[PDB]
Design a protein around this ligand. Structure first.
Ligand code: 8X7
Ligand code: ZN
Length: 292
């Protein structure tokens, strides 16, 4: 049973357990608030009872050690971690506007400048991660959180990995990513190109309003990722569709690096709003010059 109040004995801090946010893996997420500073955060509470096997305990440590080394405007802030007899608690930045998945749920297909707006911040954050030699490996709508200003914050570093040397090919991804890259499925080894693939899939879902490889059978969805079986609707811009085609290639050595993306015609030749109206959560924005 999760405690009503959580206390860290090294930093001397008390966080009051509040609203249930979401359930991921073993973890339960609750909005927690510091007794003294009156600051609210997102709290990831994992039960030790489900961390008895050292393999699962090591995963949690790897996830924390990776997340704590990350400081960026487009990454979910890390404020700490602590533990007790039965639980592991992680203290992270709380984004009150939830995640792009909620936005996708209500809004489905988004306007082209809205996608250009978010994709820029998803890339900027991922650029930071790749500069620090971190592969997220599970980039999806549900872990791209939005703060009050609707700026993207990447979170959920459970499937993340640090690249220890030049040209390293990770042979094992223990876990199941949402936008799983073909090299993961075919077990040929993988590197940074798996994140560009996820970004390509995310781009498709924001512009089209459904995932590129969604089938009833997830195993038949995997067959499609392998065969490169997708079709971009013809109502989608030929510049945006050309970027999706670049990012969704079975050959990882052919996908643009996280650094070349902001320099694609899709970004450089299109309107990228400086900020989005909070109405865009509910209503599609028109982006007009003046109001009649
Ligand atoms: C702490 C675990 C990972 N995580 C974060 O780092 C994070 C940061 N901000 C947020 N914000 C947030 C706020 C509210 C809500 N909900 C409000 C209640 N609704 C019923 C559903 C949506 C939702 C989010 N939420 C955050 N996280 C979060 C919270 C719930 C579920 C999940 C997943 C599904 C990725 O495990 N992640
Ligand atoms: Zn394993």
């Amino acid at each position: 049973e999760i405690p009503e109040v959580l206390v860290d004995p090294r930093s001397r801090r008390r966080y009051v357990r509040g609203r249930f946010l979401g359930k991921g893996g073993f973890a339960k997420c609750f909005e927690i608030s510091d007794a003294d500073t009156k600051e609210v955060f997102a709290g990831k509470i994992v039960p030790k009872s489900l961390l008895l096997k050292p393999h699962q305990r090591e995963k949690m440590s790897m996830e924390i050690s990776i997340h704590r080394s990350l400081a960026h405007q487009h990454v979910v802030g890390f404020h700490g971690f602590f533990e007790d007899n039965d639980f592991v608690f992680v203290v992270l930045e709380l984004c009150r506007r939830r995640s792009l998945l909620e936005l996708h749920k209500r809004r489905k297909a988004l306007t082209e400048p809205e996608a250009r707006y978010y994709l820029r911040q998803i890339v900027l954050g991922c650029q930071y991660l790749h500069r620090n030699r971190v592969i997220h490996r599970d980039l999806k709508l549900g872990n791209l959180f939005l703060n009050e200003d609707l700026e993207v914050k990447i979170g959920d570093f459970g499937l993340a990995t640090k690249v220890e040397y030049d040209g390293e090919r990770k042979k094992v991804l223990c876990g199941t990513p949402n936008y799983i890259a073909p090299e993961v499925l075919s077990k040929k080894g993988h590197s940074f190109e798996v994140d560009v693939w996820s970004i390509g899939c995310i781009m498709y879902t924001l512009l089209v309003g459904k995932p590129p490889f969604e089938t009833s059978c997830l195993k038949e969805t995997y067959l499609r990722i392998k065969k490169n079986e997708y079709s971009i609707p013809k109502h989608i811009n030929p510049v945006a569709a050309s970027l999706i085609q670049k990012m969704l290639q079975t050959d990882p050595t052919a996908r643009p690096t996280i650094n070349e993306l902001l320099n694609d015609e899709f970004f450089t030749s299109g309107y990228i709003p400086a900020r989005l109206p909070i109405t865009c959560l509910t209503i599609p924005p028109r982006f007009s010059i003046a109001p009649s």
